[PDB]
Structure 1
Amino acid sequence: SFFPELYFNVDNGYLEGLVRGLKAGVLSQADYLNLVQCETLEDLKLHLQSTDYGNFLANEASPLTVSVIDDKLKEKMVVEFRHMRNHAYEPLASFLDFITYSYMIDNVILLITGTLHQRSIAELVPKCHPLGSFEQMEAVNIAQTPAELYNAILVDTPLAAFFQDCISEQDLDEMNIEIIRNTLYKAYLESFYKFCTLLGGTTADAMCPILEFEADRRAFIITINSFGTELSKEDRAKLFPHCGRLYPEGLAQLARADDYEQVKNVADYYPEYKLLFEGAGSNPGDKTLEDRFFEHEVKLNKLAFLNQFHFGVFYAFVKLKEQECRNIVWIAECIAQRHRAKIDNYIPIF
């Protein structure tokens, strides 16, 4: 026990309350049932206007597009998160920056892919996810030189510490961009887990389970997807984050695994993963293991709000509202493509 109740609210009380206020706005199961029955995207806009989102979509053009709706939802999430980040203090500020590093790790992959393909970085910047946008100007006017971009990342980007798993710009040219992305993400996730444990207290006890599940689902899904690829077992084993509960000998039996049945055998030893694998029929027409892992992730994030004095609620809110944005996008896609038969596949939140 670290008695965070005594000193959390000194610096993080306002945002603690504000983020829970924001969570109160995430659509309920009933709200999703309302959105499910809309006839058109305009009808969806109207039915949505009664919720927290309100008139966020009213300023766009008459012929609504699901791309436009997705962009607006992402913009709203980014605005809220940037407000909280601007009002955060050093420790909470560092935690929020750790949340943004995840999106930076994909924007950097965009940048390196553009550079190795010799394209202007000004064309890449608009495609970056705003939550992890590179404000630093050292990452501009790169002249399409991988060495310039790599030095810019090392000298003027928080990912400098994560790129130390790599050692050279030559690694950028050699390694596949997916391997680079996943190695960076492993480094980031382990650093995040260590940071959360060093924060300790309720933050650790409420956030570490979420990152452990992230590591375990990373391991499972990387393994399951790697079968039909050139990716070797020896390189695959490097991608597994060592935070998850699988870490000793579970990740080892996965690195030794060569079939979905063996991955499921590894899962069988853990009740919380056995259930997901048994429920994931994965045959055409029903839930896949991806859907089951999203549901479990949503449950884990929901649990973060049962603890009061901790930062984990901000991460839980960001991921929950991201899930809600993807849910609304999915419902809009179903309405637009008239694929009503599967409109229920949204993951309910609260």
Structure 2
Amino acid sequence: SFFPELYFNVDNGYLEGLVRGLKAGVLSQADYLNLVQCETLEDLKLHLQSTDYGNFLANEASPLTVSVIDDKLKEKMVVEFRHMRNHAYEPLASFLDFITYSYMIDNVILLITGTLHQRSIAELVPKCHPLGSFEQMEAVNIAQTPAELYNAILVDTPLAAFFQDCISEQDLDEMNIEIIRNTLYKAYLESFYKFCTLLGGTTADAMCPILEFEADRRAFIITINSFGTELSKEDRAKLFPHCGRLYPEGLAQLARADDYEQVKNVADYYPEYKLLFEGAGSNPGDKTLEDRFFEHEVKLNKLAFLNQFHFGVFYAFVKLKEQECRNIVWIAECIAQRHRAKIDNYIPIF
């Protein structure tokens, strides 16, 4: 074993304690029930004020909206993550940067989509996710030139490594943005898994399961969604990350798969995914496959907190708080639309 116990706290111990303290503030099942019992968005804020969230929503206008609540939750998480990153050192700094690459991918996809449609990049900036902000000025004032934007990404963005999967800037106008996004995400997930493995120790032990499940769920959902589309099997198989546990012949069977029944047969070989697919009834009124995978992801991120001397705590906390913000936004949506029947679809955490 790497014996991280000896040296982890030299640099990252204070942040380990800090992130665990932050995780202790994620709403529990009782708090989720209390928020569910509300009647209006104002009452939602009122109940939420008793949790760790506090007065994050007191300043904003009395006529609360789901949009306002969602933006405030996003802003709070961005602030906390930015504080942790600012107080992090080299290895944990790279870990947190890898966490942010996920949103930087979507942001660059937005940038290229707007540019190919001749829209100002500066005017596209506000829609980008805060955690993936392109503070670099090389990819700004591009004059709506896709070639200039590709060069800017390559020169002054951490995505230059993932953009070597493509062959040239003509690929931006050639390939569909979804395929670009998913190729970028495959490369990013593979690099993230490699980095975690190189870190080794408790970090690898507690983090590789999460990335592996991410890869497997990406494979499953890409297969299930590309059935009725023009996305050929050959071009689909290029989008499966190789980190998952399906790499030997599992991804191959999925690539050859031509129906949800075949996808389920492939998933059967792995019991962990077998249960998720069995519970994913997919008919109206019961948990869908995406919801089952969300439950499994939350479970894995929670188990990430049973290890101690590892960076996986930060990724798990970021994902758990993302899920919590999604849950609160969903509860606010149910309150606003008066659809109390489905108000229990939120995936609980802790």
TM-score under structure 1 length normalisation: 1.00
- Give distance in 1, aligned partners of 2:32 and 2:292: 19
Q: How far 1:167 sits from its partner (Å)?
A: 1.5
TM-superposed deviation, 1:177: 0.1
**Counterparts of 1:323 and 1:194 in 2: how far apart (Å)?**
25
Q: Distance in 2 between matches of 1:334 and 1:227?
A: 31
Structure with the bigger percentage of helix: 1
Work out the CA distance in 2 between the residues paired with 1:148 and 1:252.
Answer: 37
C-alpha offsets along residues 161-204 of structure 1, whole Å, 9 cap, x if unaligned? 00000021100001000000000000000000000000000000
Distance 2:230 2:123 in 1: 31
Structure-1 separation of matches of 2:264 and 2:93: 39
Give the whole-Å Cα distance in 1 for the aligned partners of 2:153 and 2:123.
Answer: 18
Pair 1:95 & 2:95 matched? yes
Q: How far apart, CA to CA, are the structure 2 residues paired with 1:284 and 1:349?
A: 24
> Offset at 1:317?
0.2
Secondary structure (helix, strand or coil) at the match of 1:204 reads helix
| Correspondence for 1:169 | 169
The answer to whether structure 1 residue 17 and structure 2 residue 8 are counterparts is: no
1:81-133 CA distances to partner (integer Å, 9 max, x unpaired)? 00000000000000000000000000000000000001000110000000011
Counterparts of 1:108 and 1:28, CA distance in 2: 35
Deviation for aligned residue 1:269? 0.3
CA offset at residue 285 of structure 1? 1.4
Structure 1, unpaired ranges of 5+: none
Tell me, which stretches of 5 or more residues in structure 2 are unaligned? none
Q: Distance in 1 between matches of 2:109 and 2:29?
A: 36
Deviation (angstroms), 1:248: 0.9
User: For residues 94 and 280 of structure 2, what CA distance do their matches in structure 1 show?
Assistant: 36
Q: What per-residue deviation string (whole Å, max 9, x for no partner) do you get for residues 190-239 of structure 1?
A: 00000000000000000000000000000000000000100000000000
Which residue of structure 2 lines up, in the alignment, with residue 78 of structure 1?
78
C-alpha separation between the residues in 2 aligned to 1:92 and 1:293? Answer: 27
String of CA shifts for 1:5-62, please: whole Å, max 9, x gaps: 0000000001000000000000000000000010100000000000000000000001
Give the match for residue 107 of structure 2. 107
Alpha-carbon distance in 1 for matches of 2:167, 2:66: 41
Counterparts of 1:300 and 1:313, CA distance in 2: 11
Q: 1:310 & 1:302 partners in 2: Cα distance?
A: 14
Q: Which residue of 1 aligns with 2:302?
A: 302
Distance 1:272 1:133 in 2: 36
Moved over 4 A (4+): none
1:284 deviates by 1.1
1:286, CA displacement in angstroms? 1.2
What does residue 225 of structure 1 align with? 225
Aligned 1:112-261 pairs, distance under 5 A: 112-261=112-261
Quote the Cα distance in structure 2 between the aligned partners of 1:336 and 1:287: 22
Matched residue of 2:186: which SS? helix
SS of corresponding position for 1:39: coil
CA distance in 2, matches of 1:326, 1:39: 19
